[PDB]
């Protein structure tokens, strides 16, 4: 409960800071800004490379989560099976990186 106490205290201090930054200068009577970017009227272009590198990040992070439990696993009895599994998984990461290299993935956003 101490962790949640720290989280609540920190979140309330952030709330106090944003309340000071948002409502405290409203006491002043400066002006009202009527205010009548390079984007004139065109739609936002769908740069496909950003989406591709985002889902590549997603897949790599997923199998990084697969790769994670080695420090806990290092105390297991069957060390040979662990070594084979870890080397083959990192080899799978290398193979996926090589494929993402070959099929024009790392071009125009290298």
């Amino acid at each position: 409960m101490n962790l949640m106490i720290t989280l609540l205290t920190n979140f309330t201090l952030a709330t106090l800071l944003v309340t000071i930054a948002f409502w405290l200068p409203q006491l002043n009577v400066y002006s009202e800004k009527t205010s009548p970017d390079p984007m004139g009227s065109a739609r936002l272009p769908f740069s496909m490379k950003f989406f591709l590198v985002a889902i590549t990040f997603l897949l790599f992070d997923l199998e990084i989560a697969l790769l994670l439990p080695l420090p806990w696993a290092s105390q297991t009895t069957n060390l040979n099976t662990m070594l084979t599994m870890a080397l083959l998984l990192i080899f799978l990461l290398a193979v996926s990186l090589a494929y993402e290299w070959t099929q024009k993935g790392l071009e125009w956003t290298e």
Binding site: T6, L7, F50, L70, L83, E110
Partner: protein, 314 residues
């Protein structure tokens, strides 16, 4: 007595990032043959107070907010993720001791991009959205390489607990048998904080252009808190100092010294190199950092089995 400890952790964080701004200002001044602030008080001691009181009475920028709730929520989330994340650091004992503290910091550092995403979404300008997407892509890729490097580091350590890492670095430092991992971690701490020579958040439009000066100050304090956090993390985990169980303040002084010289090294590196391009650092990771990092992970997961040096879980 716990809330006193929480307050004494969270208020010096704000003082430390204000003095980050002040010390960075006079160091960048003195690095470039000029002088920093010395007019306000003795050696510019009262400059951050003037900065804070100036930034806490100014007018906002008044943006056409598409989502008011998201615009409010983004700086609160940014400050929360920068401030509550300092807990599990073992100096010499953490405020809250977790068995998976490094995983805790890694998860929240991975999700810290939500503030950037909401800042891009709150601004109706599409170029700000494009810059936010570019920053998010850079951050998530560089979090991937951080995850691999940290995975290698604690499989060398063998346990996820941060307090046992001090015990691990007792005879020799971790930088001696993990120097290439040390260099990749130094580029990653230089690069993950949206910093020069990879600072694309200033060159050509920021990700918070339409945000007000108060939220901009909150974002800057959050970024500098993350900078000090990961600098102290590098100091603790690659340059672990001697810790007496009866005499702790020597360890506190020692890792404070290493943290200060590592922050000075940060200000050094940021003042010596021109900015890169987006495709340049994308090429830096996706074709140069990732295979070497994978090979280092393979070598460091194969080494302790062949050396009869598998570290204890407990």
């Amino acid at each position: 007595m716990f809330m006193i400890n929480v307050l004494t952790l969270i208020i010096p964080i704000l003082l430390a990032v204000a003095f980050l701004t002040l010390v960075e200002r006079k160091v960048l001044g003195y690095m470039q043959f000029r002088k920093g602030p010395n007019v306000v008080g003795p050696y510019g001691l009262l400059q951050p107070i003037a900065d804070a009181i100036k930034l806490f009475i100014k007018e906002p920028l008044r943006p056409a907010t598409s989502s008011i709730s998201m615009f409010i929520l983004a700086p609160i989330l940014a400050l929360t993720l920068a401030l509550t994340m300092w807990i599990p650091l073992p100096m010499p004992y953490p405020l809250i001791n977790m068995n998976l503290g490094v995983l805790f910091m890694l998860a929240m550092s991975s999700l810290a991009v939500y503030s950037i995403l909401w800042s891009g979404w709150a601004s109706n300008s599409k170029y700000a959205l494009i810059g936010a997407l570019r920053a998010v892509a850079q951050t998530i890729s560089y979090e991937v390489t951080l995850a691999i490097i940290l995975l290698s580091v604690l499989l060398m350590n063998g346990s996820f607990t941060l307090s046992t890492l001090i015990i691990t670095q007792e005879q020799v430092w971790l930088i001696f048998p993990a120097w290439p991992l040390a260099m990749m971690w130094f580029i990653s701490t230089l690069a993950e904080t949206n910093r020069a020579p990879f600072d694309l958040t200033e060159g050509e439009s920021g990700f918070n252009v339409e945000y007000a000066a108060g939220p901009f100050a909150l974002f800057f304090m959050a970024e500098y808190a993350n900078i000090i956090m990961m600098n102290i993390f590098t100091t603790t985990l690659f340059l672990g100092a001697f810790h007496n169980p009866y005499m702790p303040e020597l360890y506190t002084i020692n890792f404070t010294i290493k943290s200060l010289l590592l922050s000075i090294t940060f200000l050094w590196i940021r003042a010596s190199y021109p900015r890169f391009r987006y495709d340049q650092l994308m090429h830096l990771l996706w074709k140069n950092f990732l295979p070497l990092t994978l090979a280092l992970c393979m070598w460091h997961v194969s080494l302790p089995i062949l050396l009869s040096s598998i570290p204890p879980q407990t």
